[PDB]
Amino acid sequence: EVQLVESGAEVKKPGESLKISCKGSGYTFTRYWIGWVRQMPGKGLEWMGIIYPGDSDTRYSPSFQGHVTISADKSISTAYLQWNSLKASDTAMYYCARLPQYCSNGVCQRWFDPWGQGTLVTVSSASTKGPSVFPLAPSSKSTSGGTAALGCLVKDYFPEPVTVSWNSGALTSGVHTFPAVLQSSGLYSLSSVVTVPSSSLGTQTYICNVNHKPSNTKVDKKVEPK
């Protein structure tokens, strides 16, 4: 099976250097062009450049020429994407992909297959920080039927991700854990909510369990009405 394997996720500060890698197997590496694609968070796919590992001939997109260098080491069937001075605007998923081609009279046309699993790159001034966890208490006026809503606000942490459970995992029904949003401060924030019967309040205890592995924080907050 043809396969491209890329390097692990990176968290970097602006201005630092970074080199990421893409190793091919299952085919002769030096006989296919290799490409890089950027995908910014919640956006589409942007072609960055290609390289031929046989002789390291490269072709950059005008939008990326200058800021990034594409290279290859055919002795280990590995291609590279490198930056001398990262910017926060480089924060994205990066993919490498093989580019099979059809050619007639020296003129070639390309598409991308297969693709690597992707390398996530986060570039920020912020430093590692565990979240604060605040209760989102159900109001006394639980009149959306006999259904109340409650939650936890997981604020001001870095970098991604946190995980959130409820009642140590015994409560899953009606849980919605929203995607994080990056605040102007450079720290992330998310909420997790759950809907439960109005008559269950006080009868039943609700506790959200927040886990931020980058900073070794475990937080539990009891969520009580009023």
Partner: peptide, 20 residues
């Protein structure tokens, strides 16, 4: 093997070996 390098140069601008 020099056979390897010459084939490398061929498939830079010829249809890839697995495209039908």
């Amino acid at each position: 093997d020099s056979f390897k390098e010459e084939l490398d140069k061929y498939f830079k601008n010829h249809t890839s070996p697995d495209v039908d």
